[PDB]
Design a binder for this molecule. Structure first.
Ligand SMILES: Nc1ncnc2c1ncn2[C@@H]1O[C@H](COP(=O)(O)OP(=O)(O)OP(O)(O)=S)[C@@H](O)[C@H]1O
Ligand SMILES: Nc1ncnc2c1ncn2[C@@H]1O[C@H](COP(=O)(O)OP(=O)(O)OP(O)(O)=S)[C@@H](O)[C@H]1O
Ligand SMILES: [Zn+2]
Lengths: 50, 50, 96, 277, 56, 163, 54, 375
């Protein structure tokens, strides 16, 4: 399968709403090629609560 | 000699498409930076997947 | 009706070349050709013109010939390639 | 019978006049079509925005190169067609208006449009009866029975909110009523609105409202409003501003001055008291 | 001239980016290898067909 | 701008209505413009060069820029594409090459001298017309020396301006 | 800037910056640091120093 | 046997209508073919006049230029700062032109829709009369304010809890004076660029300076207002410069005249004290929630065109109504119609009003903190 590595600290950018674009392009890489894996890691930095 | 045959090659600037028109191509394109243009395809295209 | 003219020397040279065209053949009297013009105000301007063939016998000064078909054809030419111009008159080379 | 034969030859004279009409029509028409061949086949057209319309029948063009041009001669359009702020297809060389474009949108707004039509019939939903009642009686009856409300004499309502526990299924009513009804349905996520640059959310929400309004049976779906809905705060040394800018864009272009009648709103949050009143 | 890569296409030419942001499908002078080329490198470009000239 | 700007029905009409004008003389080449830059040979010119040398013997180009000067510049530029088939023999023999060297004087237009691959400019003199030169001089001088030569033969505030 | 006689650097209001040459019509004192200056279209060389304006 | 007149007239009228319409088509294409060859011109503005022949202009697209007139350009017209035309090639001046409009102004100038006047709102008869006294009287009769010899107030600030109809009061003014309401929503101003918003503010203030009775209206200020920062996000710098544009040119040195600014906010506590002082915004005008008679007034305004029967204890509905809005009781009447269509009654029974009141009671058990008094 098309394994994809994602650090949970990848969403730590400078500019506002950039992690939205990051999630966008993550899943747009996910959709084209079929039957793929995406691995998140250390999802604390992605956020704990609201 | 391939390179001297590739001076008759073409520069092929890449772009982005806003939208098509109806019953005719009449393609509306901003390049990325310059402006926005009404262009028409070359006849060597797949006239569907644009 | 006409205040004055603003006439470039180019149309005068455009008379001169047809004068060269008639100095080599049997010249009975003179040249009668078309004068185009750029009429804007009551002042007048000419940018260009062209000629038309012409002969004239002198028995009752009424036998004199142009070609209005050729005239309007080349007028349509120069009107298409330049919509500024239009006819404004004529010219002759004999000073009297 | 002399006048009858005179009119019979006059019918031939009128046929000669029809031939003169044929000549001065066909010849002049094909010559002007040839000029329109010369001028109109120049298929690369720079498009632009009409700034003003002066009358001393004079149009001023701001190019999409962010630059300007005056022209005193309008071109191959009519002055009724030209309102302030139009995309006009202008030749590079002649700088003359040749077309009229139909759309001023983002392709991202185009990507928001719902064509896929999933399948959730109401038998897939169980035990949410009053909520289905509220939603259908609030949306489908201002969609099919405008005359019902208008004979009652108030208005259609403005807005339906979804909130509560995060597992109750809020996506399900969106998918279900989009599956069953056949209006122009439109989705929207929360963080997709706020952009890296300053002011693009205003553009995005305004163009979204425009695109939905031009397809008047319009059902707007909103997802995680609390991403952009925030109880705003006055403080110092810190503060994230543009979020409230996009939210105030949403609210003012949603409600207040310049009201609209054809918008239908569905929003879904997981928490409640983050939001402004 | 000097540019920067975005992607590499196998058909002897790839996509580059200019200084201000114009982008072209331009080919490689093949005596210096394309295995030297990685996404995120600075390259040598022409003015006449803007072709990829070599490795910087 | 193309070789298909030569409309053959316009060729027939234009040239025959010049035939019934003063003389049916023969075409000697062709002209164009390049107002956007410093007047060198476009791609369309070499695309139509074989068409014109199929039409004409010399088929000499005319290159111009209309934004230059008011009395001085000689902006016109003319050429002769020599064929690539004569790559064996020497390039531009020009039997004497002494008046060609007296054409060679400025080595003008460094991008055309980049385009010296099968190109060279040609001598263009501005020759006399005895039928026209003295009368153009008559026009020019005797219409600018007071117009009618009787008019101004301003004056009382240029006192203060000059002081 | 001024390199020397008959050669200077000016930044035109195209934003860019040019190695140019100066004329002997300009009196050389009117350069002091910074003058509104006049240029050419084609060659884009200095033609004239302007009075204080802009 | 004399029907040849009818046949000749038939063919001649067919050919005559055909010639009229076809030559009209050929004439339309003739005019549109004559108009093809013209070439557009360059938009520029006049910096200053250098000499009698020399003119210093700077177009918007870039650099500065020095050219002259043609023959008859009437050089006294060229005041420094007028917008003129330029040739593309020769680049000299062609024609003096009137000033720009910037159709961002037009999308918030023409786009006032219709509305009902200030009798539609109610229960807040202090502010109605007071805004009238502070705006309409120093623009209709300034001598009442000159005989006293006291400068008129310029800026008015509407504030209060959300939903008190702060928008619709200005909308009623926009159905009362109908003069030049430049209702800026003040959120669709900033787009992305550097100084574009500052130029739009200059444009609005010039346009308001010229068309002498203008009404400036900027809703939802707090997005573009802010207060100040310890220099955090970089876009906030241009935010504060865009705000200091207003802070200067509302006051400046050249004082505005008849430029009446109507302002509305959701919470006025977050404004900048640079904007909070008088002079710019003279009198703080506060709207609050309706009282019992005021709730009665709004309720009977909404209950006018509603199909019902003579049963309505308005005192009961207003009695259960407690601390509500312009739109709360509007929602009461709307949901009363909803409950009327519930079980298909075709009139509105009085119990539907109590059901809608308890629906409002369900609604406003999720909202609080409705008291933001500034300063
Ligand atoms: N009433 C119901 N009938 C049938 N299935 C249901 C019902 N409620 C929930 N489900 C199921 O549980 C899921 C709930 O949908 P979700 O995708 O979690 O919606 P949602 O994300 O909870 O909405 P949020 O998170 O509060 S915004 C669906 O996949 C259904 O299969
Ligand atoms: N007292 C009132 N009488 C009549 N109608 C009212 C009244 N209060 C509000 N309304 C109506 O309800 C609407 C509420 O307008 P709003 O948009 O709330 O004004 P606002 O300043 O935008 O308030 P916020 O702070 O933005 S929610 C108005 O447009 C009117 O249609
Ligand atoms: Zn060319």
């Amino acid at each position: 399968a098309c394994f994809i590595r994602v650090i949970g600290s990848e969403l730590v950018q400078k500019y506002v709403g950039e992690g939205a674009r990051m999630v966008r392009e993550l899943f747009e890489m996910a959709r084209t090629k079929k039957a793929c894996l995406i691995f998140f890691d250390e999802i604390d930095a992605i956020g704990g609560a609201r | 000699q391939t390179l001297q045959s590739e001076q008759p090659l073409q520069v092929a600037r890449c772009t982005k498409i806003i939208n098509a028109d109806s019953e005719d191509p009449k393609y509306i394109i901003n390049v990325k930076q310059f402006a926005k243009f009404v262009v028409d395809l070359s006849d060597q295209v797949a006239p569907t997947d644009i | 009706a006409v205040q004055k003219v603003v006439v470039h020397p180019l149309v005068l040279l455009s008379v001169v070349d047809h004068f060269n065209r008639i100095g080599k053949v049997g010249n009975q009297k003179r040249v009668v050709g078309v004068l185009l013009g750029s009429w804007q105000k009551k002042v007048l301007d000419v940018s260009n013109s062209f000629a038309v063939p012409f002969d004239e016998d002198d028995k009752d000064d009424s036998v004199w010939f142009l070609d209005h078909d050729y005239l309007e054809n080349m007028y349509g030419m120069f009107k298409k390639v330049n919509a500024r111009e239009r006819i404004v008159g004529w010219y002759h080379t004999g000073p009297k | 019978r002399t006048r009858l034969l005179d009119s019979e030859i006059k019918i031939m004279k009128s046929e000669v006049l029809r031939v003169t009409h044929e000549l001065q029509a066909m010849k002049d028409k094909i010559k002007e079509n040839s000029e329109k061949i010369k001028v109109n086949k120049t298929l690369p057209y720079l498009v632009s925005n009409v700034i003003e319309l002066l009358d001393v029948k004079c149009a001023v063009i701001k190019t999409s190169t962010r630059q300007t041009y005056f022209l005193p001669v309008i071109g191959l359009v009519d002055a009724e067609k030209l309102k302030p702020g139009d995309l006009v297809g202008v030749n590079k060389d002649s700088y003359l208006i040749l077309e009229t474009l139909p759309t001023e949108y983002d392709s991202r707004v185009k990507a928001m449009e719902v064509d896929e039509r999933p399948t959730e019939q109401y038998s897939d939903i169980g035990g949410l009866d009053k909520q289905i009642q509220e939603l259908v009686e609030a949306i489908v009856l201002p969609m099919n029975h405008k005359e019902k409300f208008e004979n009652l004499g108030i208005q259609p309502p403005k807005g339906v909110l979804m909130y509560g526990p995060p597992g109750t299924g809020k996506t399900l009513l969106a998918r279900a009523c989009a599956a069953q009804t056949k209006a122009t349905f439109l989705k929207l996520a929360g963080p997709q609105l706020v952009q890296m640059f300053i002011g693009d959310g205003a553009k995005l929400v305004r163009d979204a409202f425009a695109l939905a309004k031009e397809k008047a049976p319009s059902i707007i779906f909103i997802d995680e409003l609390d991403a952009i809905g925030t109880k705003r705060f006055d403080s110092e040394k810190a503060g994230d501003r543009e979020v409230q800018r996009t939210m105030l864009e949403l609210l003012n272009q949603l409600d207040g001055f310049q009201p609209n009648t054809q918008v239908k709103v569905i929003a879904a949050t997981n928490r409640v008291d983050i939001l402004d009143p | 001239s000097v540019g920067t890569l975005e992607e590499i296409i196998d058909d002897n030419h790839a996509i580059v980016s200019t200084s201000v942001g114009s982008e072209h499908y331009v080919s490689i002078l093949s005596f210096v290898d394309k295995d030297l080329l990685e996404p995120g490198c600075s390259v040598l470009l022409n003015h006449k067909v803007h072709a990829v000239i070599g490795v910087l | 701008v193309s070789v298909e700007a030569v409309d053959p029905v316009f060729q027939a009409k234009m040239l025959d209505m010049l035939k019934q004008t003063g003389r049916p003389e023969m075409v000697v080449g062709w002209y164009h413009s390049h107002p956007g830059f410093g007047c060198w040979l476009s791609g369309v010119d070499i695309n139509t060069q074989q068409s014109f040398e199929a039409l004409s013997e010399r088929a000499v180009a005319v290159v111009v820029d209309p934004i230059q000067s008011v009395k001085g510049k000689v902006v016109i530029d003319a050429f002769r594409l020599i064929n690539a088939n004569m790559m064996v023999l020497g390039h531009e023999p020009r039997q004497t090459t002494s008046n060609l060297g007296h054409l060679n004087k400025p080595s003008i237009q460094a991008l055309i001298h980049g385009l010296n691959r099968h190109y060279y400019s040609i001598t263009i003199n501005y020759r006399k017309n005895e039928l026209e030169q003295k009368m153009l001089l008559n026009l020019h001088k005797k219409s600018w020396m007071e117009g009618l030569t009787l008019q101004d033969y301003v004056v009382k505030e240029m006192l203060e301006l000059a002081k | 800037e001024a390199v020397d006689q008959n050669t200077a650097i000016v930044g035109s209001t195209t934003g860019s910056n040019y190695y140019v040459r100066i004329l002997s019509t300009i009196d050389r004192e009117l350069l002091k640091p910074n003058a509104s200056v006049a240029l050419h279209k084609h060659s884009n060389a200095l033609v004239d120093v302007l009075p204080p304006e802009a | 046997k004399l029907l040849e007149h009818k046949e000749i007239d038939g063919r001649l009228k067919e050919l005559r209508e055909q010639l009229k319409e076809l030559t009209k088509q050929y004439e339309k294409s003739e005019n549109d073919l004559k108009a093809l060859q013209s070439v557009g011109q360059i938009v520029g503005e006049v910096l200053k006049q250098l000499t009698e022949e020399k003119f210093i202009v700077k177009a918007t697209n870039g650099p500065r230029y020095v050219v002259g007139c043609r023959r008859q350009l009437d050089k006294s017209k060229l005041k420094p700062g007028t917008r003129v035309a330029l040739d593309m090639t020769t680049l000299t001046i062609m024609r003096y032109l009137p000033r720009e409009v910037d159709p961002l102004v037009y999308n918030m100038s023409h786009e006032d829709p219709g509305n009902v006047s200030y009798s539609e709102i109610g229960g807040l008869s202090e502010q109605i009369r007071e805004l009238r006294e502070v705006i309409e009287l120093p623009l209709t009769n300034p001598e009442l304010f000159q005989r006293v010899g006291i400068i008129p107030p310029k800026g008015c600030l509407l504030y209060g809890p959300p939903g008190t109809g702060k928008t619709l009061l200005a909308r009623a003014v926009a159905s009362q004076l109908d003069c030049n309401f430049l209702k800026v929503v003040s959120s669709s101003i900033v787009d992305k660029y550097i100084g574009e918003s500052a130029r739009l503010i200059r444009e609005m203030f010039n346009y308001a300076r010229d068309h002498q009775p203008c009404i400036i209206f900027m809703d939802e200020i707090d997005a573009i207002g802010g207060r100040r920062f310890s220099e955090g996000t970089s876009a906030d710098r241009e935010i504060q410069r865009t705000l200091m544009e207003l802070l200067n040119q509302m006051d400046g040195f050249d004082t505005l005249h008849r430029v009446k600014m109507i302002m509305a906010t959701n919470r006025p506590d977050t404004l900048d004290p640079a904007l909070l002082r008088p002079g710019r915004l003279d009198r703080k005008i506060h709207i609050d929630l309706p009282n019992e008679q005021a709730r009665l007034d709004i309720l009977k305004i909404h209950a006018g065109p509603i199909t019902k029967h003579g049963e309505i204890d308005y005192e009961a509905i207003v009695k259960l109504s407690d601390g509500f809005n312009g739109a709360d009781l509007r929602n009461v009447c709307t949901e009363a119609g909803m409950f009327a269509i519930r079980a298909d009654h075709d009139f509105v029974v009085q119990e539907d009003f109590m059901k809608a009141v308890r629906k409002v009671a369900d609604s406003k058990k999720l909202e609080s903190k409705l008291d933001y008094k500034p300063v």
